[PDB]
């Protein structure tokens, strides 16, 4: 019944918070709705795949908190394969390339593409990571969708198509679904365009040996019976001396404080006494999660490597079910596999099909893009549609429709009496990622330590030393990238 | 514990559903989260006001279902005061007028205004009431906000400003917050622009004598102990032969079928076994309700009438806390009052203030708009901020942001095994209103009767005879209104002549 702090949710954020509080000598209890920990991370094990991440997987340079936590728990990383060429498939043809951005040959299209990426970072520089609503043009940018912004910025259909794929892949949502201010914040708070899109030296550089699920699992191992599985929280009462937290399976927990470590909208599944303040009451109805099916097709060998392809495919257009792939082969070179995402509206559309039907569509696509009949002979298939999850709401993360971030953004991590807010959505660096989950969980934990008078105010937010195993190299630009005119810039010069 | 149908929610929709099923011989239970019925309707009674609707209030011609239900329950209507002149307040000055639309004198501005309203209805005629996602340009229109559409359509700032107020007032949301397809559907399914904005001959023509809360209250009286107050539903389990519905106060109910008569997003407050299908699981996270504070200021006398003002004020300007008012005086002529709405971002902004601070700002606004120092002498004040309600989520109703209606709209009233969906949001005529609540509750009830083999399929959806008490004048246009060019239409005519 009784403890110091109840943590609602046993994903990476809830586990990170619970570990910090436990290590500080407090009695913690984690209440998890599912029969497993990990949340939006999930590692499946079987003989065919050995292990596979069906949820969150990638980590990379500048994500120092998740790297430090995993290392402490005994985990190692390996590099996602990017030795050979990437492929950009456009208008039914594959164009192999090297470097993070797909190249453009037409001079007008070149200027347009260059300007788009540059402008994304230009705008981001005016958006505070810890308060995007304080951007000088916050209201103007929040009142526009990404579709509207792209319509203004992109003078070529080539740039608009790639920009659209970029948005879809980053946030699993349509350009017309999301606020421009929120999306620009999202990219900036991951370190900008290059950092977020890059495998080598970016967010997709590495995976955990044995799977990312091990982070939450190994913290559960430490905490023992402090983690309560199949305990969905239904009710939180703050009217009395101690906070009371009730679960669906009829149990009552009593604590001094609570950490909410669930997606913001899933706060709706809890009945509150007293009611939430007006702003949070409405906020949690305004913040949906994106839509994605993660699909992994297995092959006898990583045959693409023989053609000097690394397995990365960037596939434009409405017809293709999957817009982006990476090589998912094990470090040993076995369990050869291609990972692909079915994104946003396509997740909704293709969910109607059978698993076997999706497999056929993916294999035929891969055969076309890789130019190999070997793609038509899969040995195994795994997939997960995150849209179906009651206790996630979607993946990868929460997006903000136009008008919401400026009106409600301030209340995301505002404490409600003795409830403090974790979850990757509340992070200021790599929000949306496993890194953000760690940042937010540890910060919420320290807010409580401060409330108990155990630490000073200046220790609530804490810097992280850089990983020695995954060091970051600087992001650079060329003179031409910095100074070439936009399309309208070249027109005004003429 | 055991019954035929559990109805979740005791608002007008749930109560209408329960009544129909009860009248048909079935054993029903209504599980209501609050210590009262009525939901988004709420009639406050005290000695200072006698009675006052703090939620849903207005009914009008073409809303035949709510009129029939209320009549059967022994209720009467009266007409909202529109004897004297309406006021349009713009750029800090008041312009009195008659007719539903504020008049425009500038010929260019006139063309632009005429074309705006006309085009709203033109686009509306392309949108099926029962399937808005089937409009030929559904995707194009759904992928645009109302802000984007107004930016394209309005060639004058005057039209754009009034159109913005129109959107804010209809759906308690900003133009940039809402899908154009969804808003165009919402207006069309109320009968169009003229019907939705009109007092005389429109949505705001009448109120119930004694308050709208009586509708839900009198149905509760008929049902007796079948209505369970302070039973918020937390869990629905459909894995076994009978459906199990659990409440927060620990009770278990067992039924053949369930009707969910709550706002769609409030379905999130219920844990489902088995989990909802993917499309509904995500839909209920994508559909917020609007933001509004309804405010009623009381005076010694309806002093505005002496100046030939009826009490209606259409007020444009960021500084104005309230964008729209109506006379709220009792039909007897006493308890003189002005009702005003604080809309969308202003509801969020001004919620920070005290009740006394809000009263002061409203009085100062009304004094300026009415050119009357008497407005600074209120005798009483009542208000309700609907944004604070755990079991409503907002008011008046659910809005759809860009992209949602085409992707998720199909599943709004699709049954989930033995769960059927009521609530005003699922109506096809006056969705968002008390009328829509009645339509959806009775339709959901009949879906269950059909499932039980009690009625044929063709009786699920039923037409409603027109009220004999509230006649509906047709919506008409003039020749000039039909055929006058838009601003770009005129520019094309100029370009062609100069060739
Ligand atoms: C789904 C997904 C996510 C993902 C991605 C690809 C997919 C398909 N790829 C990623 C990647 O390559 N690298 C990366 O860093 N992140 C990636 N993501 C996102 C990542 O998985 C998430 O950012 C992260 O996992 C979020 O962690 P967080 O701890 O903040 O949130 P959570 O995992 O959703 O955990 C919440 C837990 O709470 C439980 N829950 C929900 N409701 C209740 C109630 N009422 N009571 C008790 N518990 C509750 C959930 O079950 C969950 O365990
Ligand atoms: C708020 C408002 C509404 C309004 C309006 C002005 C305001 C400020 N003006 C209107 C008007 O002039 N004319 C009109 O016709 N409508 C007007 N509206 C809207 C109108 O009030 C609504 O459309 C209508 O009342 C909605 O009826 P409906 O039955 O569909 O929905 P509800 O009233 O919200 O009732 C739902 C009930 O369910 C209970 N609830 C919620 N969650 C649960 C759970 N988990 N378990 C059990 N019960 C639950 C609510 O408490 C509510 O009673
Ligand atoms: C388009 N252009 C080339 C690269 O585009 C990318 C955009 C986003 C990303 C990051 C995505 S991939 C992932 O696993 N999660 C993300 O956020 C990667 C590549
Ligand atoms: C703008 N123009 C003049 C009239 O504008 C109106 C627009 C909508 C409405 C209907 C609003 S008032 C109400 O009580 N609820 C509504 O839907 C009334 C007038």
Can you spell out the DSSP letters for A415-427?
Answer: -BTTEEE-SGGG-
What number of CA atoms fall less than 13 Å from residue B25's CA on the CB side?
Answer: 3
Q: Which residue of B has its CA nearest to A283?
A: B288
Closest CA to A206 of A475, A471, A476, A477: A471
- A contacts of B282 (beta carbons < 8 Å): 288-289, 291, 387, 393-394
How many other C-beta atoms are found inside a 10 Å radius of the C-beta of residue B330? Answer: 17
Cβ contact B58:B205 at 8 Å: yes
H/E segment holding residue B419: strand B419-421
Write phi, then psi, for B296 (nearest 5 degrees). -125, 115
Q: Which residue CA neighbors atom 8 of ligand 2 most closely?
A: B55
- Residue positions counted in chain B: 499
The Cα-based distances of A363 to A18, A488, A492, B440 in angstroms read 43, 42, 48, 46
Helices and strands, number each (H, E), in chain A: 16, 21
How many other C-beta atoms are found inside a 10 Å radius of the C-beta of residue B67? Answer: 26
Spatial distance between the Cα atoms of B456 and A184, rounded to a whole number of angstroms: 55
- A contacts of B248 (beta carbons < 8 Å): 234-235, 271
Tokens representing B178 are 């809402």
- B contacts of A274 (beta carbons < 8 Å): none
Spatial distance between the Cα atoms of A234 and A252, rounded to a whole number of angstroms: 10
A275 phi-psi bin (left φ>0, alpha ψ -120 to 50, beta other) = beta
Spatial distance between the Cα atoms of A146 and A141, rounded to a whole number of angstroms: 9
* Distance from chain centroid for Cα A334: 27
What number of CA atoms fall less than 13 Å from residue A38's CA on the CB side?
Answer: 19
B178 phi-psi bin (left φ>0, alpha ψ -120 to 50, beta other) = beta
Using the mean position of ligand 3's atoms as its centre, give its distance from the Cα of residue A46 in Å. Answer: 28
Query: What angle, rounded to 10 degrees, do the helices at B64-72 and B434-451 form?
Result: 80
DSSP letters for A138-150: HHHHHTSBHHHHH
Nearest-CA distance A354 → chain B (Å): 14
Tokens representing B394 are 């907002």
Closest CA to A341 of A391, A394, A393: A394
- B contacts of A348 (beta carbons < 8 Å): 279, 407
DSSP letters for A125-139: TTS-TT-GGGSTTHH
* Residue in the structure block whose two tokens are 């990583």: A302
How many other C-beta atoms are found inside a 10 Å radius of the C-beta of residue A184? Answer: 26
Spatial distance between the Cα atoms of A177 and A404, rounded to a whole number of angstroms: 12
User: Hey, of A139, A168, A173, A176, which one would you mutate to test binding to chain B, going by the most B CBs within 10 A of its CB?
Assistant: A176
DSSP letters for A428-446: SSSTTSHHHHHHHHHHHHH
> Over the Cα atoms of chain B, what is R_g?
23
Tokens representing A451 are 């409330």
Spatial distance between the Cα atoms of B181 and B133, rounded to a whole number of angstroms: 8
Spatial distance between the Cα atoms of B35 and B246, rounded to a whole number of angstroms: 17
B9 phi-psi bin (left φ>0, alpha ψ -120 to 50, beta other) = left
The Cα-based distances of B37 to B50, B212, B227 in angstroms read 19, 11, 9
Using the mean position of ligand 3's atoms as its centre, give its distance from the Cα of residue B50 in Å. Answer: 62
Pocket test for ligand 3, best of A63, A101, A197 (most atoms within 8 A of CB): A197
Measured from the Cα of B292, ligand 2's closest atom is 8
B229 three-class SS? strand
Tokens representing B479 are 């020749």
Cβ contact A442:A20 at 8 Å: yes
Cβ contact A432:A396 at 8 Å: yes
Spatial distance between the Cα atoms of B116 and B142, rounded to a whole number of angstroms: 19
Spatial distance between the Cα atoms of A183 and B334, rounded to a whole number of angstroms: 54
The Cα-based distances of B193 to A33, B101, B484 in angstroms read 47, 10, 18
Write phi, then psi, for B228 (nearest 5 degrees). -110, 110
DSSP assignment, residue B124? H
Cβ contact A77:A248 at 8 Å: no
Write phi, then psi, for B6 (nearest 5 degrees). -95, 125
Write phi, then psi, for A245 (nearest 5 degrees). -120, 120
Task: For ligand 4, say whether the CB of B203 is within 6 Å of any of its atoms.
Answer: yes
Cβ contact A283:A403 at 8 Å: no
Tokens representing A288 are 């949906």
- B contacts of A293 (beta carbons < 8 Å): none
What number of CA atoms fall less than 13 Å from residue A108's CA on the CB side?
Answer: 8
Closest CA to B416 of B219, B246, B273, B296: B273
Tokens representing B406 are 């085409």
Q: Which residue of A has its CA nearest to B143?
A: A176
The Cα-based distances of A93 to A90, A164, A313, B29, B185 in angstroms read 6, 19, 12, 62, 41
Closest ligand to Cα B324: 4
Task: For ligand 1, say whether the CB of A412 is within 6 Å of any of its atoms.
Answer: no
Tokens representing A45 are 């094990």
- Structure obtained using: X-ray
Cβ contact B404:B398 at 8 Å: no
A94 three-class SS? strand
The beta strands (E) that lie in B60-212 are given as: 77-79, 85-90, 93-97, 206-208
Write phi, then psi, for A17 (nearest 5 degrees). -65, -45
The Cα-based distances of B35 to B14, B38, B251, B396, B490 in angstroms read 15, 10, 16, 21, 59
Pairing of strands B5-8, B257-260: parallel
H/E segment holding residue A40: none
Closest CA to B93 of B339, B268, B351, B313: B313
* Distance from chain centroid for Cα B64: 16
B384 phi-psi bin (left φ>0, alpha ψ -120 to 50, beta other) = beta
Cβ contact A175:A433 at 8 Å: no
A461 three-class SS? coil
All domains of chain B in start order, with CATH: 1-39+61-76+209-287+401-461 (3.50.50.60), 40-60+77-105+198-208+288-400 (3.90.660.10), 106-197 (1.10.405.10)
Spatial distance between the Cα atoms of B341 and B322, rounded to a whole number of angstroms: 5
Beta bridge partners of B191: none
A290 three-class SS? coil
Spatial distance between the Cα atoms of A308 and A330, rounded to a whole number of angstroms: 18
Using the mean position of ligand 2's atoms as its centre, give its distance from the Cα of residue B390 in Å. Answer: 12
* Residue in the structure block whose two tokens are 């209103």: B433
The beta strands (E) that lie in B222-344 are given as: 227-229, 233-237, 243-247, 252-255, 257-260, 271-273, 292-298, 309-315, 324-327, 337-343
Dihedral angle over CA of A462, A467, A468, A471, nearest 10: -120
* Distance from chain centroid for Cα B351: 21
**Which positions ≥6 away from A436 have C-beta within 8 Å?**
A424, A425, A426, A427, A429, A430
Beta bridge partners of B38: B11
Nearest-CA distance A454 → chain B (Å): 33
B303 three-class SS? helix
Task: For ligand 3, say whether the CB of A448 is within 6 Å of any of its atoms.
Answer: no
Spatial distance between the Cα atoms of B389 and A282, rounded to a whole number of angstroms: 9
How many other C-beta atoms are found inside a 10 Å radius of the C-beta of residue A390? Answer: 18
How many residue pairs bridge chain A and chain B with CB atoms within 8 Å of each other? Answer: 123
Spatial distance between the Cα atoms of B262 and A121, rounded to a whole number of angstroms: 44
Spatial distance between the Cα atoms of B200 and B207, rounded to a whole number of angstroms: 12
User: Hey, of A232, A286, A352, A411, which one would you mutate to test binding to chain B, going by the most B CBs within 10 A of its CB?
Assistant: A286
Using the mean position of ligand 2's atoms as its centre, give its distance from the Cα of residue B383 in Å. Answer: 17
The Cα-based distances of A482 to A115, A486, A487, A493, B487 in angstroms read 9, 11, 14, 17, 42
Beta bridge partners of B93: B90
Pairing of strands B257-260, B419-421: parallel
Nearest-CA distance A342 → chain B (Å): 15
Q: What is the 3-state secondary structure (H, E, C) of A252-271?
A: EEEECEEEECCCHHHHHHCE
**CB-based burial, A224-253: b 16+ in 10 Å, e otherwise:** eeebbeebbbbbbbbeeebbbbbbbeeeeb
What number of CA atoms fall less than 13 Å from residue A408's CA on the CB side?
Answer: 28
Closest ligand to Cα A339: 3
Spatial distance between the Cα atoms of A275 and A284, rounded to a whole number of angstroms: 13
Tokens representing B441 are 């509750």
The beta strands (E) that lie in A391-490 are given as: 419-421
Q: Which of A248, A277, A388 sits opposite B281 (nearest CB)?
A: A388
How many other C-beta atoms are found inside a 10 Å radius of the C-beta of residue B496? Answer: 8
Spatial distance between the Cα atoms of A284 and B348, rounded to a whole number of angstroms: 15
Q: Which residue CA neighbors atom 16 of ligand 4 most closely?
A: B170
Closest CA to B393 of B479, B285, B316: B285
The Cα-based distances of A110 to A156, A197, A485, A486 in angstroms read 10, 19, 10, 9
DSSP letters for A138-186: HHHHHTSBHHHHHHHH-SSHHHHHHHHHHHHHHHSS-TTTSBHHHHHHH
**Which positions ≥6 away from B206 have C-beta within 8 Å?**
B58, B59, B60, B77, B78, B79, B80, B470
Write phi, then psi, for A211 (nearest 5 degrees). 105, 150
Tokens representing B405 are 């209606």
A298 three-class SS? strand
Cβ contact B88:B161 at 8 Å: no
Helices and strands, number each (H, E), in chain B: 16, 21
Cβ contact B304:B65 at 8 Å: no
> Over the Cα atoms of chain A, what is R_g?
23
Closest CA to A82 of A371, A310, A317, A414: A310
- Residue positions counted in chain A: 494
Task: For ligand 3, say whether the CB of A59 is within 6 Å of any of its atoms.
Answer: no
Beta bridge partners of B96: B87
Spatial distance between the Cα atoms of A299 and A207, rounded to a whole number of angstroms: 19
B90 three-class SS? strand
Tokens representing A110 are 């070149």
User: Is the bond into B67 cis (omega within 30 degrees of 0)?
Assistant: no
Nearest-CA distance B177 → chain A (Å): 6
Write phi, then psi, for A319 (nearest 5 degrees). -65, -40
Spatial distance between the Cα atoms of A180 and A146, rounded to a whole number of angstroms: 5
Cβ contact A69:A215 at 8 Å: yes
């Amino acid at each position: 019944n009784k403890c110091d702090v109840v943590v609602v949710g046993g994903g990476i954020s809830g586990m990170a918070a619970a570990k910090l509080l436990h290590d500080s000598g407090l009695n913690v209890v984690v209440l998890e709705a599912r029969d497993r920990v990990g949340g939006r991370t999930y590692t499946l094990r079987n003989q065919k795949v050995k292990y596979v991440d069906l949820g969150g997987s990638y980590v990379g340079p500048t994500q120092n908190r998740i790297l430090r936590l995993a290392k402490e728990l005994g985990l190692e990383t390996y590099k996602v394969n990017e030795v050979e060429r990437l492929i950009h498939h456009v208008k039914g043809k594959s164009y192999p390339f090297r470097g993070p951005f797909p190249p453009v040959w037409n001079p007008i299209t070149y200027l347009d593409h260059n300007n788009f990426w540059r402008t994304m970072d230009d705008m981001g520089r005016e958006i505070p990571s810890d308060a995007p609503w304080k951007a000088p043009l916050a209201e103007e940018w929040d009142n526009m969708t990404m579709k509207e912004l792209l319509d203004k910025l992109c003078w070529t259909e080539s740039a608009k198509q790639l920009a659209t794929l970029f948005v879809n892949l980053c946030v699993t949502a349509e350009t017309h679904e999301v606020s421009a201010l929120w999306f620009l914040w999202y990219v900036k708070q991951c370190g900008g365009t290059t950092r977020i899109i890059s495998t080598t030296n970016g967010g997709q550089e590495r995976k955990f040996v044995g799977g990312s699920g091990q982070v939450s699992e190994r913290i559960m191992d430490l905490l023992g019976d402090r983690v309560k599985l199949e305990r969905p929280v239904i009710y939180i009462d703050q009217t009395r001396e101690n906070v009371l937290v009730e679960t669906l399976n009829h149990e009552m927990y009593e604590a001094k404080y609570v950490i909410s470590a669930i997606p913001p909208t899933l706060g709706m599944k809890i009945h509150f006494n007293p009611p939430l303040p007006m702003m949070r009451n409405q906020m949690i109805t305004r913040v949906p999660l994106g839509s994605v099916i993660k699909c992994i097709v297995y092959y006898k060998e990583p045959f693409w490597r023989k053609k000097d392809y690394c397995g990365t495919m960037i596939i434009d257009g409405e017809e293709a079910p999957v817009a982006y792939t990476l090589d998912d082969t094990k470090p040993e070179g076995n369990y050869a596999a291609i990972m692909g995402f079915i994104l946003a509206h396509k997740a909704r559309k293709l969910a109607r099909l059978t698993k076997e039907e999706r497999l056929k569509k993916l294999c035929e696509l891969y055969a076309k893009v890789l130019g190999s009949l070997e793609a038509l002979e899969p040995v195994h298939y795994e997939e997960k549609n995150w849209c179906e999850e009651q206790y996630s709401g979607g993946c990868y993360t929460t997006y903000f429709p136009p008008g919401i971030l400026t009106q409600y953004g301030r209340v995301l991590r505002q404490p409600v009496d003795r409830i403090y807010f974790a979850g990757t959505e509340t992070a200021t660096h790599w929000s949306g990622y496993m890194e953000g989950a760690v940042e937010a969980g540890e910060r919420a934990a320290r807010e409580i330590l401060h409330a108990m008078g155990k630490i000073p105010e200046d220790e609530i937010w804490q810097s992280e030393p850089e990983s020695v195993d995954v060091p970051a190299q600087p992001i650079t630009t060329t003179f031409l990238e910095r100074h070439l005119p936009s399309v309208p810039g070249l027109l005004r010069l003429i």
